[PDB]
């Protein structure tokens, strides 16, 4: 999943 402020997939 997307982790705000940390990681954005694809």
């Amino acid at each position: 999943m997307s982790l705000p402020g940390r990681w954005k997939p694809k």
Partner: single-chain antibody
Amino acid sequence: EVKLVESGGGLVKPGGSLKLSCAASGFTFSRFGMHWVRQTPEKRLEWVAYISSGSSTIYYADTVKGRFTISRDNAKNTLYLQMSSLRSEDTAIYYCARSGGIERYDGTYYVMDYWGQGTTLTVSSGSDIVLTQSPASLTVSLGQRATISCRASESVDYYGKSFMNWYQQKPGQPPKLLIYAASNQGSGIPARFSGSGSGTDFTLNIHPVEEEDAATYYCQQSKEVPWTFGAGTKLEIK
């Protein structure tokens, strides 16, 4: 080119209120999430608050939740931190850190890539990922090796990536990003800085050490909220 100027600090009695401001310039402010990070007089870094670029997601540290409020004005390119019910523990220099996105093949990795000089605040008279940094300090001769390790209380891995970052801080300057994503080198970071590890065990190796490497180094995990820092390791040269 990129600049961040915090302001609004000063002396405040306990239980008082105060607002910090940060004027951003040199980048498209509206497209970046922003952080507040404070540093205690004991040189301990504590993440304070985060707000997304569009203000859709807001995080606060447990020590400041409810009494602190982060906000932003994309039209004014300004970040704000409303503080109230201040305590002596709130005494720190408060930095504003930009959440810079680094695009990879599988996604974007977000790390605090730019920090301001910070404004100083002075107060008058459980499930967190704990990062155990080692050693407490180290004194190395010129050209030899310096090794700083980190043992996280639990895994900072997420989908094949290790969310471990390293920062370098010299006196009078804010922390500067050295290593992101466990092993990746920042912009113009010399190859003698090498980050490694996975899961819970990580290492920052410096070889060969030069005079300019004299600073305090911090590990930081960015997998789970709150963002947490290592206690720091001050590197000195013989």
